[PDB]
Design a protein around this ligand. Structure first.
Ligand SMILES: CC(=O)c1cc(-c2cc(C(=O)NC3CC3)ccc2C)c2ncccn12
Length: 118
């Protein structure tokens, strides 16, 4: 039902989402709640979309998930003005998420994935 890589990606997801208690990054931003979003942000990302990419096996590496997570936070800091709650929340989430997605945890998880293979 899940490969070791999928299991590892799903666990990181849960860890990252716990750093978004406001649930602002849980779901895709739409043009209705953020006017002109689709004209400014060319590659949207959110936790629910990351969740489908894992289930659909779109990720070949943990680094890909980390890139998507950074994209999530980068999009929010580009679209939202610094005085907004969403900008501040993106900065807090980026800092907390990058500690979760440290080189040491990523390398540790990659070692485990290889040990569970073949
Ligand atoms: C990531 C980001 O840029 C973003 C996220 C949201 C958003 C807000 C709420 C919410 O609860 N809003 C009420 C507190 C006022 C719920 C879910 C989402 C996806 C948002 N809304 C407008 C502009 C930007 N954003």
């Amino acid at each position: 039902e899940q490969t070791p890589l999928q299991e590892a990606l799903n666990q990181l997801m849960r860890q990252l989402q716990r750093k978004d208690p406001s649930a602002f990054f849980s779901f895709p931003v739409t043009d209705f709640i953020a006017p002109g979003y689709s004209m400014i942000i060319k590659h949207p990302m959110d936790f629910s979309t990351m969740k489908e990419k894992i289930k659909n096996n779109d990720y070949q590496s943990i680094e890909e998930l980390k890139d998507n997570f950074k994209l999530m936070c980068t999009n929010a800091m580009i679209y939202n003005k610094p005085e907004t709650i969403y900008y501040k929340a993106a900065k807090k989430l980026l800092h907390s998420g990058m500690k979760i997605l440290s080189q040491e945890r990523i390398q540790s998880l990659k070692q485990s994935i290889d040990f569970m293979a073949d």
